[PDB]
Point group: C5
Chain length 103, copies 5
């Protein structure tokens, strides 16, 4: 299995790593129908989503989507430094696949 | 694919953005039958609810309603500044659709 | 749809409001069979339960009972001031229907 | 319903109260098959488990077992003083039935 | 019924204890399909995973896998010292079976 986010990210089509090394600037979440999602930004303007669960996701990803939103909310509230995001870049905002936190 | 809470809010009828830029002043939650809900207020007095789940909600919203109550509680306890709420204004208190937090 | 805990409480028979304006003094929780419940006290001696889920409860209250126990535990651990409790007074200890927190 | 952990404990055979009045010294948890359990210790060496869910438990206890592990983890991390444990002392280590926390 | 992580770990084949006595240096989590996993590292370079749930896991392990990822995230965020990990050594990175925290 991959040993880090960069190696994990490389296993997928249409992805890239963004290196932030910064805390989350804003956290947004929605319960509106068909927009049950989270959006984060950083002070540099970079904006990312956790996608609404859909047909593009296999069953095993559903629990992981819910965990990711949990992770982003607590990272935001604790001012935890986000190291990198692995994202899909065929979505706008880019869609989070993985997160690493360090320092 | 909203970039932010304002754009997301604008996808729905009967909504508006409240800009608070302040911590939650009070947090109330109920397990009473047919009133399984949360209510928050801000220091100015403004009051908002997370609605009881009902027939106006699609299935995918159910998990998101539970998440929103989780978010409001932890935001309250951590004194996190709420930037904006997207709310449905055809309810009283106005009903929360989305929240943004920023320092 | 109520603006506050006092108005919510008044919608039900066998209820009353306790105004505590104090942090929780003790938090007790049990996983023993037929006593899967929480009990809290305040410095003044006042004691309250979250009831064991039972046939008096409608399905929609089940998730809310679990949320209330979550709320009491974190309120206790963070020393959050409890403003009011709405309780059913036909049980001993009085059974929590709703909580409000404000400083 | 019982008003406190001592009275609750007394409703069950093969139990006792341990009065600790101390924070948890160590927290251990396992996902290994048939040992999906938690173990805590105190500085005096006293050791307790949350048992693996089994046939001795009724269905209503399953959620409560999961909650208890949640409570012990956060008690451990916040250095919350444990007042008492109600345990079954027909198991080694003694098996937790209930916990009380008071400052 | 084990009283500590070392004895628990020894009940299984293909396991070993790693003694860290250090906080987690990095926390990584992925929602990408077939890589719904967590990875942690320590400042000594040591890397561990929580495996993707799979055929090797019995049903009772599923909830425990989810709990372990919750535990690692909060341990990371609170800078809690990890004492030991029990891991399976027939995976790369080694796969977490149990964790102990002390001091």
């Amino acid at each position: 299995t991959p040993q880090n986010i960069t190696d994990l990210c490389a296993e997928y089509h249409n992805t890239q790593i963004h290196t932030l090394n910064d805390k989350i600037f804003s956290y947004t979440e929605s319960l509106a129908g068909k927009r049950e999602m989270a959006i984060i930004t950083f002070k540099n303007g970079a904006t990312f989503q956790v996608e609404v669960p859909g047909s593009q996701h296999i069953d095993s990803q559903k629990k992981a989507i819910e965990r990711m939103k949990d992770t982003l909310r607590i990272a935001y509230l604790t001012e935890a430094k986000v190291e990198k995001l692995c994202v899909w870049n065929n979505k706008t905002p880019h869609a989070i696949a993985a997160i690493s936190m360090a320092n």
